[PDB]
């Protein structure tokens, strides 16, 4: 049996209104008081505006939701409504409905944010570690509330790189963090799914974030997005295991008493470790260093018990110069 070993109990000593979403009330606002300017994104969840206030005149984000059962709607928003400013989180401004088809649209903050397919390639090695600090200031952040994002993506990290404002966004398929629950696995993006996913080590916590912002950071120093490139869950855990070696494997899932699958575990193989200065070219080479690979090492590892948590990863030596900047 496997938990989390930090803020396992928050939702405990914590009153059943804060993480039982399901006896939240929806309190509807004006459907008209935003209005959509253009489109800028899109999930199979959803179509995303830029919209405007029609009272402040100012920038909003519209998400415009895809038939979602209730249920799944109130865990998003109860949740939004739980993490309201926080460090660096999306800040949810209003919920409205289509009277006649009840179509429902979350209000959000703006953030002129630059697609990271652009943006990353252009940042600086302090840009990296500035905005990887950022990122962590939101997961430790929700972590400490009993929450995980579990769709941790350069698509929902939004960046205004000209005021080098960062936000976490789209808390869809985020959960409250319970003392030994299940979680159905099929979450977070193939390119960032943490190894107990394509296992289906149910009893995750907080730690699957850690291992998706790992890929995340692994991209952009490396230079190679994503990082992870399979072509499903089970070739997921494959080009995984032909970069940390089939050994930590098989140790993670002796110690969790698992038990791969026949074409799965035969389609994994056996592959020794790769170093990660085997992925050291030209095009990266600044990106590198010895404080950047031990913290990603620290944060790609098999076992979610062995990953550095939120709080720690902030004060990693990586971000040493991010933390004196900030003490001024
Ligand atoms: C909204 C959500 O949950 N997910 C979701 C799904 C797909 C795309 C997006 N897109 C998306 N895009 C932006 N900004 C933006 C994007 C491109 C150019 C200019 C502005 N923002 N800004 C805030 C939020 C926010 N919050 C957001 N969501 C969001």
């Known amino acids: 049996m496997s938990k989390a070993r930090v803020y396992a109990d928050v ?3 914590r009153p059943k209104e804060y993480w ?26 959803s179509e995303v505006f830029e919209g405007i206030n029609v009272n402040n005149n100012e920038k909003c984000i519209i998400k415009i939701l895809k038939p979602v059962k209730k249920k799944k709607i109130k865990r998003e928003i109860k949740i939004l409504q739980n993490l309201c400013g926080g460090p660096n989180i999306v800040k949810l401004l209003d919920i409205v409905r289509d009277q006649h088809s009840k179509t429902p649209s979350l209000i959000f903050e703006y953030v002129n944010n630059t697609d990271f397919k652009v943006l990353y390639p252009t940042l600086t090695d302090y840009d990296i570690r500035y905005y990887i600090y950022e990122l962590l200031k939101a997961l430790d952040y929700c972590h400490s509330q009993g929450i995980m994002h579990r769709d941790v993506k350069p698509h929902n990290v939004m960046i205004d790189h000209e005021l080098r404002k960062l936000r976490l966004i789209d808390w869809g398929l985020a959960e409250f963090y319970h003392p030994g629950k299940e979680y159905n696995v099929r979450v977070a993006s193939r390119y960032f799914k943490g190894p ?41 855990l494959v080009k995984i295991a032909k970069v940390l070696g089939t050994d930590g494997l098989n ?28 992925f050291m070219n030209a095009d990266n080479q600044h990106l590198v260093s010895p404080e950047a690979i031990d913290f990603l090492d620290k944060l790609l590892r098999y076992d979610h018990q062995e990953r550095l948590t939120a709080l720690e990863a902030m004060t990693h030596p990586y971000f040493q110069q991010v933390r004196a900047a900030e003490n001024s």
Request: charged residues 30%.
């Open 11 to 13: 939702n405990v000593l």
């Open 20 to 45: 039982d979403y399901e006896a939240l009330t929806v309190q509807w606002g004006e459907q008209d008081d935003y209005e959509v300017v253009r489109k800028v994104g899109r999930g199979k969840y």
């Open 196 to 236: 107990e996913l394509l296992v289906d080590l149910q009893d995750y916590d907080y730690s699957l974030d850690m291992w998706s912002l790992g890929c995340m950071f692994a991209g952009m120093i490396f230079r190679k997005e994503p990082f992870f490139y399979g072509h499903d869950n089970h070739d997921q």
């Open 251 to 278: 140790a993670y899932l002796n110690k969790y008493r698992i038990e791969l699958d026949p074409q799965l575990e035969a389609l994994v193989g056996r592959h020794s470790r790769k170093p990660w200065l085997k």
